[PDB]
Amino acid sequence: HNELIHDAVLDYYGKRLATCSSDKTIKIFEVEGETHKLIDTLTGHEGPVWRVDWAHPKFGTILASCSYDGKVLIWKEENGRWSQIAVHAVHSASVNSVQWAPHEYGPLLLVASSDGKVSVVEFKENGTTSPIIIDAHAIGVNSASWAPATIEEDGEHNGTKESRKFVTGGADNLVKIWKYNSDAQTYVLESTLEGHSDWVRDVAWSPTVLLRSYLASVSQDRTCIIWTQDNEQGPWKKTLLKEEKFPDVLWRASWSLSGNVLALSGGDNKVTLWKENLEGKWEPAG
Amino acid sequence: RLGHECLSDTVRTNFLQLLLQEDIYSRDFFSTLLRLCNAHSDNGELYLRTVDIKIVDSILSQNLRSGDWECFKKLYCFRMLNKSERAAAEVLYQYILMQADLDVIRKRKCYLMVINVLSSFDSAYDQWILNGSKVVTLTDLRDELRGL
């Protein structure tokens, strides 16, 4: 239907809107400004479609949808519609998050299911899934993320190296920081951070151009602690966004693709807006 | 068959054209050739020379320009027996598209024929056929069969 959509995301080129329903359909529309005319509907899940994500065009516009069933159903526009080219279901139930990764880490998908797993789905020539699974949390993983420590993605003055940090949101009430070492094939648990005594809903990574990285750990205590990294290997410090508890029942928490402004997607269908002011402090903006 | 220093291709082109326009000779002659084509198709061989193949091809292609399913039925039979089997799938495939004289049930029947002939192949290049420069897969034909 259109009587309950759980996520919507837009491709880079601005051609297909991909709304995901909870009766098991991914209704795919046409971006024509603000007008939208339908072009597909894909039923294939056995659980409510939780989330959908787009992939950077340099490795195709790939549409990864996940339900509560232990299935991630990858589609890709082929056959004059949207047709699978991969599938990944190494979990059993409650796949929550599914986020694509930049090509400075290669073409990987970063899957979070609530069964205390996270897979790192590497993609090869034939479009093959290669889940390199890891146990994290123990009550559930809601979400997943990573970047350099010593250097960065290869360029001019960012070296190259081989490492990838993570943020994993859990339903154990923690938000763990895992660290990949591509020089050892080790996933080393590094830091465990706890800001909430209620489930960490969403986690996210700041795409800020700043060396500091901020992580917005939202919760059902209606509190967001901002986990402040001084650099790319510095400590983490709990900080308050709103100094009081939001009226917004917080689920998601996304930073802008230009700016460092944070929107918290309230159950009231209002987005409160908190960004740092001329004093150095998270204060209102909407 | 045994010309090529006792028959020239052009004189032969004219004969082949003549008996197929005259009703009295066309049927008996052309069924006869195709029975004999069947006896060498069973072998995995030809019965005919390269030149004769193209002459017949050319006349029938000009009979497509007069319409009717039957013209394609001749071109089809010829191609299957004289080993142009990917092109034979093409012949059945042209018919569904060119004609809007066919009904919706009729489009479907035709689609069903092309689809099973493509997938019976022992070759992985004969699993699809060409419409212009775009490759048409079984998957595409299948979408077409439900939509037509």
Curated annotation (Swiss-Prot), chain A:
Pfam families: WD40. PROSITE patterns: WD_REPEATS_2 (PS50082), WD_REPEATS_REGION (PS50294). It is found in: Cytoplasmic vesicle, COPII-coated vesicle membrane; Endoplasmic reticulum membrane; Nucleus, Nuclear pore complex; Vacuole membrane. GO terms for cellular component: cell periphery; COPII vesicle coat; endoplasmic reticulum; endoplasmic reticulum membrane; nuclear envelope; nuclear pore; nuclear pore outer ring; Seh1-associated complex. WD repeats lie at residues 1-39, 44-85, 90-131, 136-188, 195-237, 245-284. Present with 21400 molecules/cell in log phase SD medium. The basic repeat unit of a COPII coated vesicle is composed of 5 proteins: the small GTPase SAR1, the heterodimeric SEC23-SEC24 complex, and the heterotetrameric SEC13-SEC31 complex. This repeat unit polymerizes to induce membrane deformation into a transport vesicle. Component of the nuclear pore complex (NPC). NPC constitutes the exclusive means of nucleocytoplasmic transport. Belongs to the WD repeat SEC13 family. This is Protein transport protein SEC13.
Curated annotation (Swiss-Prot), chain B:
It comes from the Eukaryota. It is found in: Nucleus, Nuclear pore complex; Nucleus membrane. Coiled coil: none annotated. Component of the nuclear pore complex (NPC). NPC constitutes the exclusive means of nucleocytoplasmic transport. NPCs allow the passive diffusion of ions and small molecules and the active, nuclear transport receptor-mediated bidirectional transport of macromolecules such as proteins, RNAs, ribonucleoparticles (RNPs), and ribosomal subunits across the nuclear envelope. Due to its 8-fold rotational symmetry, all subunits are present with 8 copies or multiples thereof. Functions as a component of the nuclear pore complex (NPC). NPC components, collectively referred to as nucleoporins (NUPs), can play the role of both NPC structural components and of docking or interaction partners for transiently associated nuclear transport factors. NUP120 is involved in nuclear poly(A)+ RNA and pre-ribosome export, in GSP1 nuclear import, in NPC assembly and distribution, as well as in nuclear envelope organization. This is Nucleoporin NUP120. The gene is NUP120. The chain holds residues 890 to 1037 of 1037 of the full protein.
